[PDB]
Design a binder for this molecule. Structure first.
Ligand code: BMQ
Ligand code: BMQ
Lengths: 226, 224
């Protein structure tokens, strides 16, 4: 990405905090705070500890929050979900593109009004993505561009797909990518196209999360700056 | 549907309780309880009041709860979402099929392991559904059949699509359909294929929710 008006992710590493217990979640996040300042919080944690967990993370840690809720409902419900989520302190929210343009627009409008951001998930990192998602991936990405979407989520496990997504969305867009580590994606190859990588279990399940985070960062030192 | 062991939804009417305040949500639900015993609780309410709200609905009104979370993540995450959801008193959970068979199977395994139900959302009711979901709907339904899914969600706004979906899933499957009221779906044509209809705003935003529910039931009395 060439734009400077994007969230500045420390070390280009976003922690996918999917532990389902407040104690383990707060412990691991705290132990890696030195390397990460942007945390992706999803339903595994939220449905287990509640939305206030978002406020607490910003309190204890001075981190940005990406609510990975893969919003995928009708326009009316999507609007409500985004409103509740931003009200709770989320800086950005991840939204699915497959439900259509109106569903995505609903999220974009709320984000616009509240001054927050929407990240469009154009395709996924798991095996199942090949069944229905990849066939529509190109068009979903193009729909995002036409809608004026500037933030995207693409698969680390499929660098060949990530290259294509980047070409479609352009350099004036921001791209983050999950699937690194546990799913087999490589941090370095992924950062050839993505602006930041998302890492979950490789860090939060490690005997030493801090060392795991440090190791990943060391492995991409040549791609770290700016 | 022709199956005898299907979910028994009173008056074939499911309340989509999408109000975002526990007071209005609980009050309106109580107001229509004599007409509805099955409530669909989604993220608008859950993200606003917390997951404990599900048990509250059960304790207060003894209604069955369908957690409409449109689960649409990778298998591993879907697993966690379903587990947390069934631990909250949800009798069932709605999952997306677009992410593929592994994502759906993950939900099915948890439901089976925790003795609850999974509803597979095939085609959606809004206009945008025509862009990508509609073209994959029949295949998603067939995937559901092959996986052993017995509960489905289809659009009331497109009865002709609902008819095709019913053909694919068979009569031994349970089908619920949203889109009645606010979205212009016709209850009559919808119930020709769906076992139960989902109604939200046409009821919870009505000056008199009870009267609203009553009216809906009156318009489909011949199907009850
Ligand atoms: O295509 C995608 C989207 C997504 O957000 N995710 C999420 O990214 C995280 C990956 O975590 P992990 O590093 O495999 O443990 C989880 O929170 C997933 O739900 C993914 O793995 N693939
Ligand atoms: O295709 C679909 C799926 C679905 O769950 N829904 C949900 O069904 C409800 C419909 O509410 P309403 O009657 O339009 O106010 C909402 O909670 C929606 O999120 C839908 O409208 N269409």
């Amino acid at each position: 990405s060439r734009r400077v008006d994007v969230m500045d992710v420390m070390n280009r590493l976003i922690l996918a905090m999917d532990l389902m217990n407040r104690d383990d979640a707060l412990r691991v996040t705290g132990e890696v705070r030195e390397y990460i300042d942007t945390v992706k919080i999803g339903y595994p944690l939220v449905l287990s500890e509640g939305m206030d967990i978002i406020a607490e993370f910003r309190k204890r840690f001075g981190c940005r929050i990406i609510a990975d809720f893969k919003v995928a409902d009708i326009p009316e419900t999507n609007e409500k979900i985004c409103r509740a989520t931003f009200k709770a302190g989320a800086d950005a929210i991840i939204v699915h593109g497959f439900p259509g343009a109106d569903s995505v627009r609903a999220c974009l409008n709320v984000a616009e009004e509240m001054g927050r951001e929407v990240f469009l998930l154009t395709e996924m990192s798991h095996p199942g993505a090949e069944m229905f998602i990849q066939g529509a991936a190109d068009e979903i990405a193009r729909m995002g561009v036409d809608l004026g979407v500037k933030n995207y989520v693409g698969p680390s496990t499929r660098p060949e797909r990530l290259s294509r997504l980047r070409e479609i969305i352009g350099q004036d867009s921001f791209l983050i990518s999950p699937g690194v580590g546990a799913q087999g994606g490589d941090p370095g190859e992924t950062l050839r196209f993505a602006d930041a990588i998302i890492v979950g279990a490789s860090i939060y399940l490690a005997d030493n999360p801090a060392a795991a985070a440090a190791g990943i960062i060391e492995s991409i030192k040549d791609l770290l700056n700016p």
